[PDB]
Structures are given as C-alpha cells and as structure tokens.
Ligand binder design. Structure first.
Ligand SMILES: Nc1nc2c(c(=O)[nH]1)N[C@H]1C(S)=C(S)[C@@H](COP(=O)(O)O)O[C@H]1N2
Ligand SMILES: Nc1nc2c(c(=O)[nH]1)N[C@H]1C(S)=C(S)[C@@H](COP(=O)(O)O)O[C@H]1N2
Ligand SMILES: Nc1nc2c(c(=O)[nH]1)N[C@H]1C(S)=C(S)[C@@H](COP(=O)(O)O)O[C@H]1N2
Ligand SMILES: Nc1nc2c(c(=O)[nH]1)N[C@H]1C(S)=C(S)[C@@H](COP(=O)(O)O)O[C@H]1N2
Ligand code: SF4
Ligand code: SF4
Ligand code: SF4
Ligand code: SF4
Ligand code: SF4
Ligand code: SF4
Ligand code: SF4
Ligand code: SF4
Ligand SMILES: [Mg+2]
Ligand SMILES: [Mg+2]
Ligand SMILES: [W+6]
Ligand SMILES: [W+6]
Ligand SMILES: [Zn+2]
Ligand SMILES: [Zn+2]
Lengths: 652, 163, 170, 652
C-alpha cells in the first residue's frame, strides 16, 4: 500500500465538466518525490511549448506535498503549477496554511485542471464526494469574503478554501490565489485560474493519513521539536533579530526597521534613503503596528506564528506575513498605516504584493517623466495615497491604462513605447524582483538571481550566511555546531570569508565555492518544495531543524521508500534539471539569465562570465544553459534528451 | 477525598496551529502513530481568525439527545458559535465522534502516559493540566420521588418504574 | 426539514441581576409561582463582578458521569470557572440539579407558554430565542423529563430501591 | 403556615458563643410588617436607655425585608439596626445587593447579635447549618478582600458575605458594612459590629420561599415590570436627566455634572463654585469615567443597574453608586480621578463616604486656622491628595490625631476645643449631612432635616418634586397621570406651586401642605424599609411602580395577611412613631431637631416654629416632640405610653 502520499489525484476538465480520480505511479514518487517534482513531470509530457498560458490546453495544478498531513512540524505547503502568462515560462508558487493537509485528509495528492468553464464555477471536495458548483453569485467578491460566503452556503465551517479575487477574474498577470493567512502569490497563477473560470477550490477532508514506520517517524518529529526549542533558546549571535531565528522573516513581530528602510529601495525600486529611520518615524510605525496587530498566528502544525491578523479601523480584518508589510509603503513613499490599509484591498483583490506596488510606482514615474500624460489617468486625484488607491482599482478592473499595467512592467513598457522600457529596470525574465539595489557585486546572489527558476531571490537563498563575521572567533563559534552542512568545506569557506580585505567579495569566495553554495541552497529549497515542508523550518533560515542529514530518514520512515543522502541529492537534482528542461523547451536561453543592468553599482564582467560558466558546468549544462544529453541520461531523464535532439535543441 | 484534574486552557495563547489535533489523533490511532486524523482528536480547536476566536475544546461526555434549545454566546465583543463551548459527544454535530462509524470519543488525558501529548506538542504553552484533592461525595431519593409525584402523578411514576 | 431553536445570550448586556433565576424557578414551582428558589432555576448566571464576569448558563442535557478532565478557560484577559461553560446536569456541582434531591433539571423553553419567561423578564434585552429550519434529520433519543429523573434516581440508588420506595408511597 | 417571611430568626450570643433559632410572632408581622419595624420592636423591649453603644447588652440586628426573596422586582434590601456610637440614638442602615434574599433562602428573617466575642470570628450560615468560625487570619483585611478569602476557604462561591474593613475593627464612628456593590454606610453600625468582634457574616441559602396567592402576586409583579418599561420610555419632561428616571441617582451613568458641581458645597461643606464646570473639566472627567467604568450592574432582581464596577490603574476593582462618586472629590478640591482612587481605599476600609471626607476636610480647616498644629500631623506630606490619603490611613488606624477624628466632627470638636465646635457646622444630632447649603429657606426640607430619624436628607425625600415647573401646562401634564398620590390634593398643591411670585417658597406651599408632603414621603420610605423594597423603585424617584395603592395588594397576596391602604398607612405610622419613641427614651427632644445654623442664608424663625409645631401636631406628638399617650393608645402602643409615664417622660 501507499504511505505519506495518498496515491491518487483528481483530473478535472472544466470545459467538458468531467471529474475523475486517477491512481499515480510509485516510480514517479521514487524519482521526483512529489509536490513540485511530480508537478513538473506532469507539465512536461502534457504541456508542449506551443501551448499558450490562456489556452484550454494549459494545466493548472494544485499539489499537496509528500509529507503533508503527517505529524511533521510545518509540512503543510501547497504547490500551484502552471505556465505563467507574464514570463511565458513555468510558474510554480507556494502557499502555506491549512489547505494542502486538508487535501491529503480528503485523500488526494494533486488536482489537475484543464480546459475552461464558460460559466464561473468552483470545485467542492468532501472525501469521495467531488462536484462543480455554480459560482455566478460570487463574481467580483474578494478571496477571503468568497471563502466565508461559500463556507456559509455549503455548511462546512471547517472546510479549507483557496480563492481568487477580482484581479484573478480579470486575468491580471500577477493575480494571486488566497487562503486565510496564506497566498500563492507570484507567477500569475491567479490569472490562469480565473481564465479557466475557476473562482475557488473548496476541500473538506476527514480520512486518515498513514505512514510506513510510526515510532521512528514520530521520533524524528520529536527530535525536530526539541531542536526547535533549543534553536529558540539560542539565536544566531551578533546578528540582527530578523535573521537570527526560525520561520519566515518575522516582519510581523517587533524588530528594528532601520536596516530595512535604509537598504530596500523606495518607489519603483529607485530611491534609497540612508537616514529615513528617525525616532518619530519609529514611534509612529510602532504605534500603528501595536494598534493593528491583533494576533500572531501559525500555519498548520507549527509553533513559529509568523503570520498576523491585521485590523485597520473601518476595514475588514485580513492576514499578513513577511515583506508585504513594507512594499506597498515603500513604493509610495508613505507610512506603515497607508501600507496596511492598501494591503487589505490588494489582498482581497488577489494581487502579488511584490509586483503590484512596483507596477504602480512605475506608472507614476512614467507620468512624472512625461511618457504618460494626465489624459491617461481619468480623474486622477491630487493626493499621493489617493492616487495609489485609484490606480489599484484601475488595474484590477483593467480599466483604461489599467488594462495595460495589468500585464506587468515589462509588457506595459513594450506596449507604451517612447522609452518606457528604460523604466522597467527591475525585471528578470519579465518578472519584477525585490526592490533591492546593492552597491558591491555579490557573486552568490549574482548566480542565484540569474538561474533561479522561481525568479525570486528570497525563495532560493538561505543556508549560507548573507554576510561574514568581522572577528574570527564568531565564525569559529558559529561553525562549531553547524551540523546542517553537507560537506565540511562549507565551514572552512565561512571561516575564510571576511568583510574587508583580500578574503572578501567579490573576489572571495572563489567561483567554485560560490557555485557549491548556490547549488546547496537551491537544493534545500527544491527538497522543501517537493515534500511540502515550509521553508521557514528548512531552506530559508540558518541552522534549521530540517537538513540534508535527517530528511532522508523522514522520507524513508514516512513514505516507506528507500532513501539516503546521495539518493535525495540526486533526486532534487533530477526534478530541478527537469524544471530547467521545461523552461528550455519554452525558449529560455543563457541570454535571458541576466540581472537588471543597474542591479549593482560595481559590475565585473570577467568575473560574472566565469561564475555563470562554472555554475553551468557544475549543474551539468551547456555554455548556453541547456542540460547535456549525458547528464540527462545519468539523471534517468533520457526521454528529455531524446526530445531535445529531436527538436533540434541539442546536436546528435 | 479523591483527586480531580483541571485542564487549563489559555485561549489567549493559542495561535490556531491545530498541532494538538494532529498529535492527539496520531497517538489515539491504531496502531499508535500509524496515522493521524484531526476528526478523531479528543481535542478540537474552535478556530476563526476573522473573529479572533482560537479556543481548544476537549471531549466530555456522551448524550443521546440534543438540547431543546442551543446556546449562542456573545462575550467581550466576540460573537461565538452555536454550542460553541459544549464538550459533549452530542448527535447535533460531527465533533468528538468517529468520522466513519459515528461512535463517541472521550479524552482520558492519555491514560498511561507521563505527559499528555496535546500539551507536549504545544511549544507555545497554552495547555496545562493540574491535579488537586477534594472530599469525595437516602432522604434525597425520597424527596425526589415526592417531587416527581407532584409533577407527573403517582400512577404515572408507578407505571414508569415497572417499565 | 425540522426546527432548531437558539438561545441568543449577549453576555455583554447582562447586569447580573438574576431576575431570570427568579422567574424561572417561580414558574417551575408546584403549583406555578407558589414558591421561588434560584437553586432550582434552569438558568444560572455565572457572576463575578470583580473579574467582570456575567455569563447566563442554561441547563442542558444529563450525564451520569463526570469528565476525566475539567476545563478552566482564560479568554480575553478573563479567568473563567472550572466547567464554567458546561450546560450539563453533572454530579460535580449543585448547578442544574435540585438542591434537596439532586434531580436533573432541564430547560424546555417554557414549553406551553407564549414566550420564555427569562427572556420576558430580562428587561435590558440580554436574552432572546430564535428559530430556523434544517434538512439534517432529527436523531435525538427524545426522552421525557420524568423518565430522565426516574433513570437518574435508579442509577443513583438502585433499580429496586426506587420501586420499593415508590410502592411505599402509593 | 407562614408566607413571604420565614417565621424564624437567629439569636446569637457572641460572648457565650451560643446559637439558637427562634420562631416569631405573626402578630408582630401584622403590626409592624417587618424589616425596620420589627427591628425597632426588638430594640425597644430588649435595649433600655442605660445601654451603651459599645456594651455587650447592645444589639446588632441584620434584617431581611418582608418581601425579600419573592419575585418582587428590586425587593432585596437588608436593614441593619443598632444603637449608634456617634449619635447615641437608634441607627438603622440599608444595604442592597444579594445578601437579604440569600438569608431568606436560608430560612431566616433576622439575625440578632448580642454580647462580644473576645477573639475575632465570623458567622457561617448554610440553611440549617450555622456556626462560628475563627477569623483571626482575616484581621485588618479589606471587606471585599475578606469576602473573597472566606469564599475560597469555605468553598462556597455562591455565598453572600457582609463584612467590615479595618475601620470597623478599630470602631470608627462611621465605619460601614460592605457586601459586593452594596453598603450599610451611615450610623456607625460597622463600629458596633467590630466592637462585638464580628468580622463578617456569611450566608448560603438554597431553600424555597413561598407566597400566599401565587398568580395574583406574579400578576402584580408583571404589572410593576410593564410600568417600569413605560416609565423608561417616558421620563419626567423638562427635568434634568438624573431626576427623571427610576432607581438610585444615576451618578454612574453619563449625565451633566454641571448642576452637581455648582450646587454641592466643596471642602468641608464650605466653598460653593458657581463656574467650576468648564469644558476642560467636563472632558477630563468624562475621560476618566469612560476609562474607569467597567460595567453598570444591578442589585438582585432589578433591571436598573444603578451600580458600577470601577477599575483604576494599579488598584483592585471595587463597586460604586450614587454620590460617593463626588464627595471625596469635592471635599478635597480635586478631580474625579483622585475621588475614584481614594474611594477604593475607603471602601475596602469600610467607611461612610458621606462623613469621612467631611471629617478630613474639617481637620484640614482646623490646621489652616491654627486650632490644630503641624505637630498634630506627624509627617504630613506637601501635596493635597497625599495629605488626604495620609489622613485616611491615620483615621482608620486611630493613630494620633486619627484616634480623635475617628469619632466624627462633633466629638472631635468637643475634645479639641479652642473654638473647634464652630467648624463642625454641618451636623444634626451629631451626624454629618450632605454637603449642601442652599440660599432660600425650604419648608419641606426644613421639616425633613429636622425630624427624619435616618438623619439623612436623601433617605426621606422623593415622592414630591423638589422644584416647581415654570409654566402651568407642564404641571397639568405632570399631574395628569400621577396615580401614586394618596389624595388628589397633592396634585392641586403642585398645580399652585410656582418658582417666583406669591405662590412660591418659603410662603407657599402652606404649613399644613408641607406637613402632608413630608408625612407622605417619609411614610413611603418607612414602608420600603419595612418590606425590604429598594427605594429606587418606590419612595425615592418620581412616579414609581410601587405606591400606596398597589403595596397593600403586594403585602396581601405575598404574606397572606389582610391589608388595605389605610391599614398600611396606620402600620407605617405605628413603627415610625415606635422608632420615634425609642429615640425619645434615649434623651432626644425638640432641642436636638434643628438644622445647621448656616444651612440657609435666609432664615424665617416664625415660619419655622409654625412648621415644626404643625408637623408635631400632625404626627400626634407634644410640643416637645414626644408622642402623646392618646396617639400611642390609638396605634396599639399602649405599653410605650405606660413606660413613658412610668419614667416621667409624660405626665399622668
Ligand atoms: N516550501 C516553501 N515554503 C515557503 C516558502 C517557499 O518558497 N517554499 N516561502 C516562504 C516565504 S518567503 C514566505 S513569505 C511564506 C509565505 O507563505 P504563504 O505562501 O502561505 O503566504 O512562506 C514561506 N515558506
Ligand atoms: N498577495 C500577496 N503577495 C505576496 C505575498 C503575500 O503574502 N501576499 N508574499 C510575498 C513574499 S514575502 C514572498 S516570499 C512571495 C511568495 O511567493 P509564492 O508565490 O511562492 O507564494 O510573494 C510575495 N508576494
Ligand atoms: N429600601 C432602600 N433602598 C435604598 C436606600 C434605602 O435607604 N432604603 N438607599 C438608597 C441610597 S440614598 C443609596 S446612596 C443606595 C446605596 O445602596 P447600598 O446600601 O447598597 O450601598 O441605596 C439606595 N436604595
Ligand atoms: N462605603 C459606602 N458609603 C456610602 C455609600 C456606599 O455606597 N458605600 N453610599 C452613599 C449614599 S449615595 C447614601 S444615600 C448613603 C447610604 O447610607 P445607608 O444605605 O447606610 O443608609 O451613604 C453614602 N455612603
Ligand atoms: S514556519 Fe512560520 S510561515 Fe512556515 S508554516 Fe510555520 S508559522 Fe507558517
Ligand atoms: S497546540 Fe497550542 S497553539 Fe496549537 S491549537 Fe493546541 S493549544 Fe492552540
Ligand atoms: S452540542 Fe452540547 S450544547 Fe449543543 S445541543 Fe448538543 S448537548 Fe446541547
Ligand atoms: S490529553 Fe491526551 S486524550 Fe486528551 S486530547 Fe490530549 S492527547 Fe488526546
Ligand atoms: S461539569 Fe461539565 S465540564 Fe465538568 S465534568 Fe461535568 S460535563 Fe464535564
Ligand atoms: S426559557 Fe423557561 S425553562 Fe428555559 S431557563 Fe428560561 S424560564 Fe427557565
Ligand atoms: S435577567 Fe438578563 S440582565 Fe438580568 S441577570 Fe438574567 S440574563 Fe442578566
Ligand atoms: S433600582 Fe438600582 S439601587 Fe434599586 S435595587 Fe435596582 S439596581 Fe439596586
Ligand atoms: Mg506565498
Ligand atoms: Mg446603604
Ligand atoms: W517572503
Ligand atoms: W444616595
Ligand atoms: Zn522590517
Ligand atoms: Zn453628577
């Protein structure tokens, strides 16, 4: 029998209105683990490159991670996968909360949506009872609001609901999918969901979820918990609070917003304010936050409570985590109050909190320079904040200029012309990045920005420290108990790393070192995104309770398959290179793998080229960024190579 | 004097994670930890973040009948749910009942364990069980019968006893 | 479709006057209104002005056994009483059980009267009772009050003691 | 069998430590109703005038009103009776809440305490189980605090507790007895209670309380409730809020404190501030009150919720009603904040909120003039408020000067000398009055101040309006539905009464009219204080639901005795004149029945004498204020007259 996973998925054709449960192949589990991996396997041989993002042939997949529904702390992530309407590449997006485990309790590992429903509908799941309900009465409603209405209707207060807002219905290229305190944010998967006419997915599950080796698994869980306790009693020394503990960036818990408001770039990732964090600003923000933060809350089976309920006066309560707290503020040169207020609207609408404020700031820059006229903004108010609310509504409705901006900064700039492309200066592969423009080049982050398939810097970094310690004793004390490292060398590297001197950046660490680091970090992220484990307890923070040493034990005792460290490494490499191959098949080359021109003030071309080359070589790819026939054969991906040669992507 | 156990529940500390449900169902599963199913947990967390309601509810006793009327509280601004605080395996809802058969479920504070699993897996520290001693417990019978007679009639009582 | 009824208790309006106890016990005297005794009321207000607690608790159904664990809540800064939300006629407290006999008490929403009397006597409006229809089939083993008290006394004293004591009175 | 009342009382000898239940005489019920009346009957033939207030022979009585424990709305008062250590006369004091009905549910109508316990003890009552518990561990504890500790000890959370604070233990002549939101305040009964070594009385009752005619009684109750609703939907028109509704003066509910802070006399009933109520003061007081008022709460079986829980920062929560909110503030020339804060201390200590701040203000006046030196105040702080806290503690401990002040303004002034008597200018029969010094003489209030046995102006006034209407139409509209009036004449009087002109005060109403009015109001108060009914629903407010017309129906259907309007009037007259006789036997004469010299600015001796004479004549008394042998014979009080002649109080 199958363990940890359920062994079944749901095939849903929205056009024909057909629902079918299909058993999965355990070999696929042994090869690609699950979640993101098996998602990629599905997309590979069911979505050819001729398929458009808004075509019925495109697939929208909701995947519940392998170990979701097991006693494993924090393992609760949902992985949504499709073809992004913005990047035209593969889009996978992670959402936390309670949905994925609910799906596992319903007895399913994935839901695969194809075709398009002509009428707005939603999917109701309750164990073995699955049906498509009409949702025409929910048109335009917010995501959370929709969830509540549906739960009232179906009389299922304990049902988990993933929904889109109005922006999802109007196919905004950065429309999200919302569920409680959790969001599938980037990529534009919300746009795909809306395009298929799917308003929401409602799941209620009450079946059991078995594991292979009980006592061993729960022992591993207990070990994780104990390590969490110890890790909370001992944060990373001499490091700013938000980079010292476990979980997602604790932006909701009180900290020093000095480093944030003086390193992040305000406006359209433009202005840097070196002395913004005055006492007045600090007290005002602290006051607003104390008034607005109702409670710190957690995802399923986790004690970190990274999330928070936000209640602004005169507004419905919503939930928030991480940097969504800052972006809307920073992009508008406003205060925390404004940010919190507009984030409510944006969250109900279903918008990526990264791209949307950058888009609005971009538009206002275009108005400033003269590329866009006042005529392009019918009834534009005088006040700044008011202008942002106005533009927000214009975008989610695709009204006038909003219709263009809804396509993202890239496709907007290409349609507006007159030098609008110059102002879309924060994109990579047509995807907006963190409003962060550093000074001195960072090799590791160069590689990560360039190659990361998520096209988001925060969802690939983690296991290796962002900065070195000034003194050596600190480094020694830190590497002392650093048990998460795959090889001992990673300690030595961090021992040699210095802030200044000949052992500093960008010349140190060496190219090969940086390649190793990026490989490791990315690997941990891919493992997390396959197992359904929250990055907050693994790939993202320093010294996590989940690492490359105990993970194989978890997969073994949980799923009941053979697994060791090397097999796991090779698996991660396998479906990572598979995602890579998928992106290659849709036209991506080395050309597209470049950071924004102004991303750094200090660039070093001969170092960058060597970095990229060495990394390609380490991944087992071409000089053009394409996986070689050999490495594909080795990773059991022969069919991929055969197709590559057959399509003329590789020479025979 | 006998001994009683007070399950202290700090709803002001619970963060809604539902880990209690997980570990409880996990342990109370057959064989131990061979599965987990929140619907089989002796503790069920009343959860609504929009209302700022986070309340762990433990399983009490079994009743073969619903109340004639259901209570729906409003306290300190919070509009709680119908039968929101009731610990009973009552046939008016799925709570504290087997999701398959329908059978009732009761918490026994993990009879035969050092520390109750729901409490150990609550790293935030919202659940604490305590113990204390209290003095353990014919005219009342007679007065009760004389009370029933005056309400339903003597013949009715005499007929009800013999049936 | 059957009908369920709901006792809408807004504990924020309550003033802890216990009028509900008075009028309930009054109406349940034999004959009606003859005596008066809050201890036999089917509604008991949890009152503690020092903790600003005023929680009307309505008698619920009957259980012969105590729970192996009793819950004591802390909610919104308030420290509530052990079992301080339980409606059950339980052998652990003097609530919802006759002071002289320990007979189960039970609220029938003044079955027969035009309107609930506790509701009628709470002038500030802290109480109300509403109805709604449900498609869920009624699965209650609808047992009569006399039968409940009878089985309670039978379980407490004996299936033969009650017969012989009743026989020596009729 | 007996109805409404229980028919038994508890005789407790604290010296011998003996407890006994004693049946009562139903004739006493038919003659003196109950509560205050039967209390007076007990004191009369068990406490001769040679008995000192602090002697073992003195009696301390806790009486539960006749209709207490019945469904009658608001009927819940306890009447405590003894010989006042301050006035040396009879002291009866009323407390609300939940104690009296609890006693009735325990199966008792009174508790009679004689002798003195050498060790500090308290009385535990639980239906038929009565015992004396040691209370040495409660020495010095506050009243409420004591109640809570005891309830924890005895494991009786639903027990009602009446207790004294430290001031009661140290025999302060204005020490009170406290129970939840309720206080037996004036008289010094707390001092008597402490002097007998009684720390508290704890009662738990679970028996039934029967009435004679069920359906009729509950019908009367329903009538009362309906009238309460109507009365709340229609307040007295063109009258300031606090004088328009039912219940005790709604000082806890938001109103206009303009009339209060500009009519009451600040300090030691001295300073009058005509323009104190500025906007700043109003907003500050409103703010403090909004912050401190936790909840409006009621006594047993009443919807008026006149009480309020008060929670000041850093202080235990306590409860407050009526003018205790103002006195402590006004006497100190401070703010509402200070008042609320010190009232907590005072309440826990067990002090009459009327006399205590007047005493402290008095002392400070003596310090000001020079009669008292700084030497008399060891370590007197500089700040005013601090001085009041200091003096408070000095008084409740009877420490130094505190030992003298603890005896009240009169006995203090007599002991200090050097013209200290001139500053005790607000006493009547050695008892401090309301800090109210009007200008033009008021005939009605002259009589009431002079003759009232409670020696408190607020506990005798009520049924007749304090002021006339300017226009006549208002008077007509008011007398239209005025059904509470015994005779129609009371309407006509109020119709002729005018603010200015020949039909105004002090010449109008006429002497006989004023006599009738005072007689009526006092009668209603005595009825209330006999039945146990709260004055808030009867004698105190205008147009109450309890009046002279329906009260006999209540007594009839409730207690099962014959009763009509005239019989009730004569009963009230009976035990009122009985209380009068008791006071006469302890030395009181016409001499002692005078208001403070400076009580009015405009005095009219020839009018005052005529008033007092006519009133004496109407009550059936001498020109010296003594009930005549004839009127005593008529009221079935022959034994009183016989004793009067035998003692040489009357001539044969
Ligand atoms: N497996 C996995 N878990 C993850 C992440 C991820 O990228 N992969 N992202 C983290 C980050 S950066 C954030 S801000 C939170 C947000 O969770 P949400 O998608 O439910 O809003 O998820 C965290 N957990
Ligand atoms: N609407 C919305 N957009 C959001 C977020 C969010 O919580 N809500 N999280 C931001 C952060 S902090 C991260 S790490 C990513 C999450 O990426 P995802 O799409 O994989 O969940 O999106 C960003 N955009
Ligand atoms: N029956 C009756 N009710 C009464 C009184 C009284 O003397 N007799 N006093 C009133 C006044 S003047 C006040 S200030 C409050 C105080 O109530 P308490 O005795 O419970 O403190 O009770 C009010 N109700
Ligand atoms: N300790 C204390 N003193 C108090 C009060 C009180 O509530 N508590 N009430 C005041 C009011 S408004 C009145 S009318 C009288 C009540 O006195 P009595 O009820 O003992 O007759 O005293 C005053 N002194
Ligand atoms: S680690 Fe933080 S973000 Fe991740 S599931 Fe737990 S509480 Fe949620
Ligand atoms: S484990 Fe703790 S935070 Fe989680 S649901 Fe239970 S009591 Fe609440
Ligand atoms: S769940 Fe509890 S409170 Fe609700 S009807 Fe059933 S027994 Fe009564
Ligand atoms: S105390 Fe034990 S039986 Fe009760 S809910 Fe917790 S784990 Fe389950
Ligand atoms: S009183 Fe209520 S909560 Fe306590 S054991 Fe009985 S049924 Fe359970
Ligand atoms: S509705 Fe009737 S039976 Fe129920 S508590 Fe109220 S008065 Fe008693
Ligand atoms: S009648 Fe209403 S306001 Fe009064 S105590 Fe009862 S529930 Fe509270
Ligand atoms: S009217 Fe006010 S003072 Fe009188 S009993 Fe009711 S709550 Fe108490
Ligand atoms: Mg997300
Ligand atoms: Mg009083
Ligand atoms: W993030
Ligand atoms: W008063
Ligand atoms: Zn920050
Ligand atoms: Zn006032």
């Amino acid at each position: 029998m199958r363990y940890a996973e359920t062994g079944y998925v749901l095939e849903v054709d929205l056009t024909k209105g057909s629902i079918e449960r299909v058993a999965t192949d355990p070999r696929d589990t042994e090869l690609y683990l699950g979640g993101l991996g098996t998602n990629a396997k599905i997309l590979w041989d069911r979505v050819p490159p001729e398929v458009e993002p808004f075509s019925p042939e495109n697939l929208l997949i909701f995947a519940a991670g392998l170990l979701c529904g097991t006693p494993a702390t924090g393992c609760n992530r949902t992985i949504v996968s499709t073809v992004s309407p913005q990047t035209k590449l593969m889009a996978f997006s992670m959402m936390g909360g309670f949905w994925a485990p609910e799906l596992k309790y319903a007895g399913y590992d994935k839901i695969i949506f194809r075709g398009k429903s002509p009428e707005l509908v939603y999917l109701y799941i309750n164990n073995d009872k699955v049906e498509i309900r009409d949702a025409s009465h929910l048109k335009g409603k917010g995501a959370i609001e929709t969830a509540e209405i549906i739960k009232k209707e179906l009389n299922e207060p304990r049902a988990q609901v993933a929904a889109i807002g109005k922006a999802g219905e109007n196919r905004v290229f950065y429309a999200s999918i919302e569920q409680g305190r959790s969001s599938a944010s980037r990529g534009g998967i919300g746009a795909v969901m809306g395009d298929k006419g799917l308003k929401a997915v409602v799941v209620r599950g009450t079946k059991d979820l078995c594991v292979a080796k009980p006592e061993e698994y729960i022992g591993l869980c207990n070990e994780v918990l104990d390590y969490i306790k110890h890790r909370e009693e001992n944060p990373i020394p001499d490091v700013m609070p938000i980079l010292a503990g476990l979980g997602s960036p604790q932006e909701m818990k009180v900290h020093d917003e000095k480093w944030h408001t003086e390193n992040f770039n305000w406006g359209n990732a433009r202005t840097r304010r070196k002395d913004f964090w005055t006492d007045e600003v600090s007290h005002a923000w602290e006051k607003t936050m104390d008034k607005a933060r109702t409670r710190l809350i957690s995802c399923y089976n986790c004690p970190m409570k990274c999330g928070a309920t936000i209640s602004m006066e005169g507004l419905p309560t919503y939930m928030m985590k991480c940097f969504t707290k800052l972006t809307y503020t920073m992009a508008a040169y406003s205060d925390l109050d404004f940010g919190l207020r507009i984030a409510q609207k944006a969250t109900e609408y279903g918008l990526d909190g990264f791209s949307a404020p950058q888009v609005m700031a971009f538009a206002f820059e275009l108005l400033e320079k003269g590329i866009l006229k006042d005529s392009d903004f019918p009834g534009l108010p005088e006040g700044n904040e008011e202008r942002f609310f106005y533009l927000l509504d214009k975008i989610v409705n695709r009204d006038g200029i909003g219709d263009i901006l809804a396509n993202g900064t890239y496709w907007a700039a290409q349609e507006i012309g007159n030098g609008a492309e110059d102002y879309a200066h924060n994109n990579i592969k047509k995807h907006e990045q963190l409003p962060l423009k550093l000074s001195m080049l960072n090799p590791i982050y160069y590689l990560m920005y360039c190659t990361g398939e998520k096209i988001n810097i925060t969802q690939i970094e983690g296991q290796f420290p962002q900065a070195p310690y000034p003194k050596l004793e600190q480094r020694e004390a830190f590497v002392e108990d650093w048990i998460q490292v795959p090889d001992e060398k990673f300690k030595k590297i961090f021992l040699e790393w210095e802030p200044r001197g000949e052992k500093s950046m960008p010349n140190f660490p060496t190219v090969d070192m940086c390649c190793d680091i990026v490989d490791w970090q990315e690997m941990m992220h891919y493992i997390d995104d396959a197992l359904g484990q929250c990055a907050g307890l693994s790939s993202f923070p320093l010294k996590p309770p989940y690492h490359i040493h105990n993970y194989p034990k978890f997969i073994a005792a949980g799923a009941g398959i053979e697994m060791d460290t090397e097999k796991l490494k090779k698996a991660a490499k396998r479906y990572r290179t598979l995602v890579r191959a998928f992106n290659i098949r849709r036209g991506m080359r080395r050309v597209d793998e470049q950071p924004p021109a102004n991303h750094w003030k200090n660039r070093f071309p001969e170092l960058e080229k060597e970095l990229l080359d060495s990394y390609y070589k380490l991944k087992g790819w071409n000089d053009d960024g394409i996986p070689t026939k050999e490495t594909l054969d080795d990773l059991g991906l022969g069919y991929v190579g055969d197709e590559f040669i057959k399509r003329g992507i590789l020479s025979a | 004097k006998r001994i009683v156990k007070t399950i202290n529940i700090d709803a002001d500390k619970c963060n809604g994670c539902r880990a209690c449900e997980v570990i409880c169902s996990a342990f109370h599963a057959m064989p131990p930890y061979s599965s987990n199913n929140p619907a089989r947990s002796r503790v069920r967390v009343v959860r609504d973040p929009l209302r700022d309601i986070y309340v762990p509810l433990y399983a009490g006793e079994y009743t073969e009948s619903e109340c004639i009327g259901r209570d729906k509280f409003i306290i300190d601004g919070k509009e709680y749910d119908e039968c929101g605080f009731c610990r009973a395996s009552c046939p008016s809802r799925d709570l504290f009942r087997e999701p398959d058969s329908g059978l009732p479920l009761k918490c026994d504070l993990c009879d035969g364990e050092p520390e109750p699993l729901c409490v150990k897996w609550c790293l935030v520290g919202a659940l604490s069980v305590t113990e204390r001693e209290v003095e353990e417990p014919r005219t009342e019978m007679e007065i009760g019968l004389e009370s029933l007679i005056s309400r339903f009639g003597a013949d009715v009582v005499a007929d009800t006893v013999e049936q």
